[PDB]
Design a protein around this nucleic acid. Sequence first.
RNA 1: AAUUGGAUUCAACGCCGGGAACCUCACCGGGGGCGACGGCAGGAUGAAGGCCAGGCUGAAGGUCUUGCCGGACGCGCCGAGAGG
Lengths: 186, 123, 50, 111, 102, 56
Amino acid sequence: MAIERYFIREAVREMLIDEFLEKELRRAGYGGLDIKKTPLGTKVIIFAANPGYVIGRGGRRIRELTRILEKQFGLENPQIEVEEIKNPYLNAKVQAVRLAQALERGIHFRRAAYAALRAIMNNGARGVEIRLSGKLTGERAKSIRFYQGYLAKVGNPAETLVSKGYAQALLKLGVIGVKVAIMPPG
Amino acid sequence: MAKPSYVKFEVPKELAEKALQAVEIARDTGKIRKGTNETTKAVERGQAKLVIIAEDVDPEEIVAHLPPLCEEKEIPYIYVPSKKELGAAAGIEVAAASVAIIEPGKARDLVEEIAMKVKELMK
Amino acid sequence: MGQKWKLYEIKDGKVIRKNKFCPRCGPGVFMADHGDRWACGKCGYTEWKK
Amino acid sequence: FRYRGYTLEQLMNMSLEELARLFPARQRRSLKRGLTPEQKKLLRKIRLAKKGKYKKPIRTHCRDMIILPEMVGLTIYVHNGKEFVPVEIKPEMIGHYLGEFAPTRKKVEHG
Amino acid sequence: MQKARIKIASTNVRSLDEVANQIKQIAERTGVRMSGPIPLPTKRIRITTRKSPDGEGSATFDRWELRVHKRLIDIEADERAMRQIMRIRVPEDVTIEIELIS
Amino acid sequence: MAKADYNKRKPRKFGKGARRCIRCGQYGPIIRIQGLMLCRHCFREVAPKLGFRKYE
RNA sequence: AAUUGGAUUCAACGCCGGGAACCUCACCGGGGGCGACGGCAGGAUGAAGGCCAGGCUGAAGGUCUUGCCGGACGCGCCGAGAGG
C-alpha cells in the first residue's frame, strides 16, 4: 500500500512467528528471534539457551519449523539459523520460561524462587525481582514477591533498561503466573 | 462365481496365495476389475484371462449361471475361501468378492502358470 | 450403503444394459429412467426425455 | 380513485417497466435490482394456485416483497416469527410491503 | 547518465540519519554529482486507544505514535555507480526506493 | 441419513461479523483495520514488540 | 413467542458494544443435520457423496414415492473425543 502501512505489516509479521515459537521452543529455552526479511528467503534467527533441542531429535524440528513458515508467509524458502543467547541468565524471558517448567514440575515456591534468584545474581544482575501471582495452592488471590538489589525506576527509561520475562506455568489444580524482572548493570 | 458348497476341483493352499499375489501386481502395474456386478460382465464378453472367484456369494443372481458358462468360454476359474481374502489380494485393503484381471502387467510369468495348472485339472 | 443394485441383465454368453445412455454428454453415463425425466449420474443434471 | 392504479386488470398487462412510473422509490428498487432465490420458488406457488399442478397454500417468510397486481386474490401465509398469519390481498394493497400486513409483535395493551 | 532518486524512509530516528549521512559521504567522491539529503515530513501516525478492557469507571486512554520519516536524495550517476552506493548495511527497518529517469 | 456439506453458507458480505482477528478469533470484539486486525486488548499486549511508543 | 447476557452506591447506568437490517448473536419459531480413536458385530452381493420429477418445504434430494451414476469402506452403541 504505502510507507506507513508496510512497516506495520512487517511488525505484525514479527508477532505471529514470535508467538508460536516461544510456545514450542520451551524445551530449547526460548529467548528471541532476529528476523531478517528479504525477497529471497525469510531468514529467522531463533534464540535459545540450547541449540540441540531446536534442531530436534535428528533434523525433525528444524524441518518442522521450516515447514510451518511456508504456510504463514509468501516466502516459501525460509532459512533456519540457531544463534545462542550469550547470557541466558541476563535474559529474563529465558528465566521466566525456565522458572515455568520448574513450577510445572511441582518444586516448592521459595525454593524454586531462591535458586532462580541465585543463578542470575551470580551471572551479573545489579538487581532482580520475581513475582508469582496466582492461586498459591489455596483459593485466595495473593502474589509472593522475591526481592533483591535495585529495581525499575520511574517513567519509561525505567522499562527499556531492565529485562522482563513472563510465562504461564501451567498446573492441574489451577494456574500460577510467572513474572521475572531482571535489572542488568547499566 | 462360487458358493461355500461348490467343490468341483481342488485349490491347494500354495496355488491360492500365488493367485492372491498375481492379482496384487495386476492392479499396481496394469488394469483390474473388482465388484461382482462389473466382473459378471468381464468373464462373459471375453475380457478376463483367468477368473478368480470367492466362495461366499448368496443371494444367487450371478452364482447359478457362471460355473457352467465359464467352461464354455475356455477360461479357468480358481477359488479363494473368502471376500476379505480376495479383497486384500485385489490390490486394495477393502473387499472384492470377485475380480477380473484384464491384462497381466508384471504378474505375466505367474498368471500363465496358474491358468494351465487349473485348466489341466478341471476349469 | 444400499444393496441390491444388480440391474444389468444377463444373456447366455453376453451382457446387455437395462438403462439408457445419455444424449447430452457422450456414452459412459447411465440414466435414472423415470419414464419421462432423466437424472444424470456423473454429476447431477436436470434432463428431459429425447 | 377506487381500486389503486388505472384498473386492477391493466396493471397485470403492464408488469415490467410501466408500473415503475406509478410506484414509490422503494418498491421500484427491489423489482429493478431483482429479488433473491426464495422469491423464485414463490413464483411457482402463485402459478400452481391460479392454474394447473396441485396447488399448495402459499406460505412465505417474504416480508421485503411489495404487492403486485397479478398476486391480488390469493390468501398469503406470512410467518410472524412464531406462526403463519393470513392476509386476503386486495387491489388497495398495490404499493405497500407484504411484511406490513402480518404482525412483527403480538398485539396486546401495555401495563 | 540517469538522474536517480533515492527515497529513503525509516520508522526510527537513529536508523534513518546514519544511512542518509553515509549515502552522502561515499557518493561524494567518484563519478557522482549529488544534491543534499533533504528531510520531508514525519507522517506521524496517531492511533488513539481505549486502555481498559472493561471500558469501566474512568478508563485511561493510550496515545500512540508511529512516526515515519522520509529523507530524499537526487543523484547523477550510472546504474552501476548506484549499486556501489547501495552496498551499505542499512538498519532493519529502512525502506530505500529507487526511481530511474534520464 | 445423507446430506451435503456445511461450514456456514449465508451472506456475510460486510460489517463486524465479516471480520476476525489474527490473535483471539472474534467477530464483534475489536478489529483494528490498518493491516493489523486484532482486538484492542491484544493490541495493548502486542505493541512494544510492534515498536509503538506509549508516550504521548 | 423471544425483547440474549453480564454490570449495580462512590468504583453499574454514551458500561463490555472502537459500529445489532441478514451477518453479528449468545434469544425465539419453524425446517433440516455432522459424533473422532480404540472394542465389539457389519463390508464390493456397488457409496458412505451427488441427483431429475411430482408429493412435501417459507427455501434445502431436505424429506418420501421413484429410478440411478462416479469409484471405492463405515453405522449402532460402549470407553472416550472435537464443539459449546
